[PDB]
Amino acid sequence: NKITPNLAEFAFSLYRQLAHQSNSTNIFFSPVSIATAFAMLSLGTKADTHDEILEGLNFNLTEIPEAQIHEGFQELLRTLNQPDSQLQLTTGNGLFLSEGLKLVDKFLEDVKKLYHSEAFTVNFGDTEEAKKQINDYVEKGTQGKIVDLVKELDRDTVFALVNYIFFKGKWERPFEVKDTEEEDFHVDQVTTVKVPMMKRLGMFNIQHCKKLSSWVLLMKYLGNATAIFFLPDEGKLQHLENELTHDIITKFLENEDRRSASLHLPKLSITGTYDLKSVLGQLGITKVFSNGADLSGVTEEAPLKLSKAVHKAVLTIDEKGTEAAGAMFLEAIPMSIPPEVKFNKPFVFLMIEQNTKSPLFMGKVVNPTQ
């Protein structure tokens, strides 16, 4: 889809920002989930406020018309929220505005029947009630997986945006629980930690790429997405982070050559919690969060600004994220001895949706127990 390049540039911009902030913490976020939310918010903005957001999502407004942009997110939201989607994706957007504001019907209509998002009116005068009825909406939304999300609300708040996403994928070619063993993970060159290490001898889309100095592994999920893992050579993590591009990711997805390997991949569970006011502020999106915000598409008369914007992303990697099977296959291993390739030191990853080539997720594992 025609907005995919911009989505990919946004993914990297945000990742590089986060990888600059801290180099000692796990990173996990949805580029799609955040862009989509701020695209939607942009429908209620005008002029500088509006342009700042779309430019902050890596769109050049002197090259791409706004219709394409939105029809792009539309198309992408259509293919993500299919009824018959085997993809374990629980995504949601909460808009919370102080009651007493006369809200534009069209903005509430555009939000709901174009971006599938929830827009609520609450009394921000009571911090506990508002905070509980925000965290309660994420309780229902995530089937019960994300609780007590919003830690604090400052009194001046009039408008909060809450962006959540939970993913627990089922491998097309799963591991066997019986083969998972506790093993070392190297968090630095002299230090190890114990992790459940998943293990399978089989045929993988796995290759060492000299340009990126990295092992590159792609594994497909049920539903149509692909996990790609990059394991840098010693000292080559940052080189790896700098050299990633969309065309490269694209090139790896195009090739379905398989080779013999003994793979080690940690079973893992990670969450990234991000303050998007802070984080997107660093990428050029400040006006919509400040007193000068033109939110007249949300409300015509009264001054309004987005007080609070939160992103929470949750990921489980395991042997296969469902307890019932049915699919039976069989990979042929050749007689020759297979390389052992262990994902037992810091690595970078992405989940790419197959129809659009969109980056559903990006992240880095520095320490699986962190």
- The pairing of strands 359-365 and 308-317 is unpaired
Question: Could you tell me where in the chain the CATH 3.30.497.10 domains are found?
Answer: 1-171+267-320
Provide the 3-class DSSP secondary structure of residue 238: helix
- The pairing of strands 268-275 and 308-317 is antiparallel
Helix extents (H) in the chain: 4-21, 31-41, 47-56, 66-80, 105-115, 127-141, 237-243, 246-254, 276-282
Query: CA 118 to CA 137: how far, in whole Å?
Result: 10
Query: CA 34 to CA 313: how far, in whole Å?
Result: 10
Chain centroid to CA 173: 23
Query: CA 177 to CA 45: how far, in whole Å?
Result: 50
Cβ-contact 162, 149 below 8 angstroms: yes
Joined together, the tokens standing for residue 68 give 């394409």
Question: Count of CB atoms within 10 A of residue 172's CB?
Answer: 14
Q: What is the DSSP letter of 194?
A: E
Rounded-to-10 torsion of CA 38, 141, 314, 168: -120
Cβ-contact 197, 182 below 8 angstroms: yes
Chain centroid to CA 344: 22
CATH number of 172-266+321-370: 2.30.39.10
Among residues 74, 357, 91, the alpha carbon closest in space to that of 226 is found at 357
Amino acid letter, 130:
A
Q: What is the DSSP letter of 175?
A: -
Question: Count of CB atoms within 10 A of residue 242's CB?
Answer: 12
Question: Could you tell me where in the chain the CATH 2.30.39.10 domains are found?
Answer: 172-266+321-370
HSE-up (13 A, CA, CB side) for residue 363: 30
Joined together, the tokens standing for residue 221 give 């999920």
Query: CA 180 to CA 200: how far, in whole Å?
Result: 9
> What is the sign, positive or negative, of the torsion defined by CA atoms of 241, 281, 33, 7?
negative
- The resolution, in angstroms to one decimal, equals 2.5
- Residue showing tokens 């000292």: 235
How were these coordinates obtained?
Answer: X-ray
Query: CA 138 to CA 132: how far, in whole Å?
Result: 10
Joined together, the tokens standing for residue 237 give 């993590």
Query: CA 112 to CA 86: how far, in whole Å?
Result: 24
The third-level CATH classification (topology) of the domain covering 1-171+267-320 is Antithrombin; Chain I, domain 2 (3.30.497)
Task: Give every CB contact of residue 307 below 8 A, 6+ residues apart in sequence.
Answer: 154, 156, 157, 158, 159, 160, 289
Joined together, the tokens standing for residue 16 give 């590089």
Provide the 3-class DSSP secondary structure of residue 211: coil
Among residues 174, 329, 334, 199, the alpha carbon closest in space to that of 260 is found at 334
Cβ-contact 251, 207 below 8 angstroms: no
